[model samples]
Structures are given as C-alpha cells and as structure tokens.
Target: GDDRELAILATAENLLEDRPLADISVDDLAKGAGISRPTFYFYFPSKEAVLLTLLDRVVNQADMALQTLAENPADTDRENMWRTGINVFFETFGSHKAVTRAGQAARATSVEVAELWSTFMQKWIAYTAAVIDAERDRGAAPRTLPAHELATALNLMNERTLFASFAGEQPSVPEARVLDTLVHIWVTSIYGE
Candidate 1:
C-alpha cells in the first residue's frame, strides 16, 4: 500500500518537475506512473488533491518538530525557541523545496489553492498560539496579550518573514536577528514599561 501510494505521488512529482503544477494533468501523471488514467483517479481525484497531500506531509513534519521541542521543555528556552523553531521550519521547507515552489505557484494562480494555503496557515497559527499559552501557563513567558492575540501576531510575523525571504526582500539581518527584533517588539508592545 505504501509503495502504491508513493508510486502515485512520485509520478505526480516527476510530472511537476517538467512543468508548473497548474500545467500538470492527471493523464500526465498516469502516463509517468505507467498506470491507466482511471487508476490515477482512484488514488487522487485531482491535481490539487496530490498537492494537498504533499502539503499535509510538510505540515505534519513541522508539527512533529514542534512537539519534540514541547516534550523537551529544556529546549524551550525563551531565547532559543524562536531560533530553533525558525531553523526547523526553514529546514523542513528546504527539504521539500519542489513542493513549496509548486504550492507558491499554485497559490498565485488558483483561488482554490490560495484558500487552502490560508486555511493551512491558520492551523499553524493555532498551534503556535497553543504553545504560547502553555509557556505562559508554565511561567516561562509573560502573559502580555491574551493568548489568542499573541498567537495571531506571531503567526502574522512568520508569514511576513517567510514571504519576504522567498521574495529576496527580507531585511538584511540573520533570521535570529529578525526573530530577536520581533520578540523585543512583542514584549514592549504587550507589557509596556
């Protein structure tokens, strides 16, 4: 079962390599996989479905990385968590560069894909919010804003940074530097002196 699913995904990925994701068709994937078109449909109803499956894998990887940090609370040092999290996030994205590129391309051209991207991002934001809430509960971080607002802000910042970096318009600072700046801004804004 694993081999069959991977074969289907691999075929789709191979097809994607030759063209933009929007240009890829199920027939193309089927031909690549040496399967009939109907068989391809049996595994994935549409091209978007394949893309969503890949995106889910990436999201799960990120979630597991975060979970590891949570499990080893010693790894959640306030000064290090941001740096470590960013590193892990970037590393995951880098490992799935093709999927990330495909997703970006699809998001730019497909309303459906863009909406899906937004939904996935909101899920990620919720996860980050929960982490912030837990840290506050444990007295590891100050409860500046309500947990919801703080989570929203952090999630927005991550989006801004990610797109800027991808567009080559990121600030001329290391990621850690940018994160430190964000932490300072969040701290000062939430609990003013």
Candidate 2:
C-alpha cells in the first residue's frame, strides 16, 4: 500500500547520488519514481521535506544500532561491542552518502531539518551518556569529565568529522583514519589504558 511512497523516496535517494540536492527538481523526483510532478507534491511539499524524512529514517537506524552498546555494556566483549557500534555507524552513514551529503548541506538553511537533527542528536547523546555513566559506575570509564559532557562532546566530534569527511565539498581525511581516530578516542576515554 505504501509502495509508491517508498518508490518516491528511493528515487530521491538515488537521484541525489548523481546531483546535488538543490539540482533535483520536484519533477525530477516524480519522473524518476514513475509518478507525475503533481504526485510529488502529494507526497512531499518540497524537496527539503523529502530530505528531512530520509535523514530522520537513516539516523533512527543508527540510533537503534548504537543503543545496543548501552544496553549490553556488561558483556565480556563490551569494548569490541563499542567498536562494532561505531563501525556500523560509519558503515550505515557511509553507505547512504547521498543522504549524508544532502542533509548536511541543507541543515543550516532548513531550520526544520536542523531542529529534527538536534532532537535526534539529543536522544543519541542521552543513550551514549547512559552508557558512559554505567561504565563509570563499573569503574571502566574515565572520570575526567561527567558522562553527559563527555558524551555530548564525543557525539559532536563524530558528527562534524563524519560530515566533513563524507560531503567531499570540503577536504576529507583518509577514511580508515577517520574511523580509527574516533574509535581510539572512544576507547581511550571510556576504557583507559
């Protein structure tokens, strides 16, 4: 029943790979999805709205994946679990490079998208902070900073670093180094040597 809607979004995501978000018109979206231009408006009021919806969906998956580390921090392989969670994050976002590019580029001009991103980020922070707090209580995490502050800084660092490294308009570091650097920071901070 929702196939058409799904097709529309899939089309948008695919189209983004070939062009900047601004370059794709509503007609382009509809035509790519095999719908009329007017049908595009029926599903989304604007291109940015489509971008926002896609961004929200993508981040939710990442959020769900990261929550596993928080929920099972006591596992014997908890440190590796932490690494897996971060690696999956990079994998998920990296796979959707188009959404990452469009979402980051439009975030400033699109207040609604910015607000949506902020809300999701807060949830991510809350989850990560809880994990940090649990580790601290178990005498595994660093005590240099409060859990909330440390989590916030770490999340912000990852988001900015990933955005710059993925968007390609700006300079990018070596892909392996980016993920390694993040994992190094997280592991060192949460489970110090």
**Which residue pairs collide in model 2, if any?**
none
Candidate 2, poorest ten consecutive residues by summed lDDT: 67-76
How do all models score by TM-score? 0.71, 0.89
Residue-by-residue lDDT tens digits, candidate 2, 1-193:
2777898899999999999887999888888888887877888899888898899889887877676655655455666766776776788899898998888788889998788789988987887888788878888665777788888999898888877777753566667678878887888887773
Which candidate number maximizes lDDT? 2
In candidate 2, how many clashes are counted? 0
Off by over 4 Å in 1: 74-77, 104-120, 133-143, 167-193
Tell me the spans in candidate 2 whose CA falls farther than 4 Å from its real position. Answer: 68-78
Q: Can you give the lDDT of residue 47 in candidate 1?
A: 78
The TM-score leader among the candidates is 2
lDDT (0 to 1) per candidate? 0.68, 0.81
